[PDB]
Amino acid sequence: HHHHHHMVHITLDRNTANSWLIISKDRRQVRMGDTHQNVSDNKERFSNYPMVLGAQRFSSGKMYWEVDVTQKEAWDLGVCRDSVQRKGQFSLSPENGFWTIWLWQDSYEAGTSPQTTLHIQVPPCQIGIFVDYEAGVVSFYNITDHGSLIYTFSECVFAGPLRPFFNVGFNYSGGNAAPLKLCPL
Ligand SMILES: CS(=O)(=O)NCCc1ccccc1
C-alpha cells in the first residue's frame, strides 16, 4: 500500500474513555488500569468495555494512522460513527456503526455480522488503518509484514462523521496489560 501520505495525527478523547482506562499525557497511549481511575461519569463514556474514541472527526477524504499492539492478547481497532451506543451490551458490526478487526483467543477476526475469520501468517505488532470516506472503504494493513493487507470493508454506509475507535481489551488473564500506542508519522 502507498496510503502512508494520508497520515493524520490522532489523539485520544479522555471524555469518551471507559472509567478504568489510563490515557497518557500526550493522549497517544491507553492502557487498562487495575481499578476505576477516579473520573466522573458522563453520557459519552463506554460503560461495559475498555473502549475509547479518537478526538478527530472525519466526514470526507482519505485518512491513515498506525497503532502498536505489541504483546497484547486481546484488542479491537478501527473506526465508528460518532453516534454509536456508549452504554450497555452491543456487538461490533457495521449495522451498529463499527468497522473493526480484533484479536481474541489467538485468532484474528473482522467485525462483520457474523464475524469473519482473518488469515494472518505474521502476528502483527503494528496495524495500519486506512479510511476513504467518499469510496466507502476501511482497510487494515499488517505493518510487521511489509504492509500486507489484512481486511477491506467496502460498500460501507458510514451514515455520519467517523471517529477512530480503540478497545484495549480485558485483562482477566494478567497477560493483556500492555497499552495501545498511536505510532509516529
Ligand atoms: C482484570 S481487569 O482489569 O481487566 N477487570 C476489568 C473490569 C472492567 C469491566 C468492564 C469495563 C471495564 C473494566
Side-chain angles (χ1 to χ4, degrees), residues 1-184:
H1 78 85
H2 301 278
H3 297 313
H4 302 107
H5 66 102
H6 302 291
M7 183 69 81
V8 293
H9 182 81
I10 300 306
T11 60
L12 301 171
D13 182 350
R14 303 188 163 280
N15 284 339
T16 67
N18 176 276
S19 62
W20 286 50
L21 297 179
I22 300 168
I23 289 167
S24 67
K25 179 156 57 179
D26 68 2
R27 296 186 309 107
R28 298 273 287 172
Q29 311 190 17
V30 56
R31 69 189 178 86
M32 169 66 85
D34 281 332
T35 190
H36 187 289
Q37 292 306 127
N38 205 32
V39 294
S40 66
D41 208 357
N42 69 52
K43 62 193 207 174
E44 295 180 72
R45 295 197 186 290
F46 287 101
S47 61
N48 288 47
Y49 312 104
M51 292 166 181
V52 62
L53 303 187
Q56 289 73 37
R57 284 47 148 14
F58 301 125
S59 287
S60 71
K62 294 175 178 184
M63 288 69 54
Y64 178 77
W65 60 99
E66 291 180 357
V67 185
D68 194 300
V69 300
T70 298
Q71 70 126 154
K72 293 190 65 56
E73 298 175 345
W75 50 260
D76 317 327
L77 290 174
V79 289
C80 64
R81 299 196 185 128
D82 62 354
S83 57
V84 294
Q85 173 187 349
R86 310 302 171 88
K87 309 301 185 183
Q89 295 168 91
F90 55 89
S91 46
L92 297 177
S93 63
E95 304 99 275
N96 286 342
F98 300 87
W99 298 266
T100 63
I101 67 171
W102 63 77
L103 172 62
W104 168 254
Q105 297 189 166
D106 205 24
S107 74
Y108 299 92
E109 298 171 324
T112 54
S113 179
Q115 71 266 29
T116 302
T117 296
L118 301 173
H119 300 96
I120 302 190
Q121 177 58 31
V122 175
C125 294
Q126 297 93 32
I127 302 284
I129 302 173
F130 175 71
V131 180
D132 184 335
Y133 198 102
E134 275 73 28
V137 170
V138 183
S139 293
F140 300 82
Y141 299 91
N142 183 340
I143 301 316
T144 307
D145 183 43
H146 309 287
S148 58
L149 180 69
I150 296 173
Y151 192 77
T152 290
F153 292 89
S154 73
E155 310 189 279
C156 296
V157 178
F158 299 133
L162 289 175
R163 299 184 65 181
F165 173 77
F166 309 85
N167 185 356
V168 300
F170 296 119
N171 186 32
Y172 294 133
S173 63
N176 196 38
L180 293 175
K181 309 185 189 175
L182 282 154
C183 306

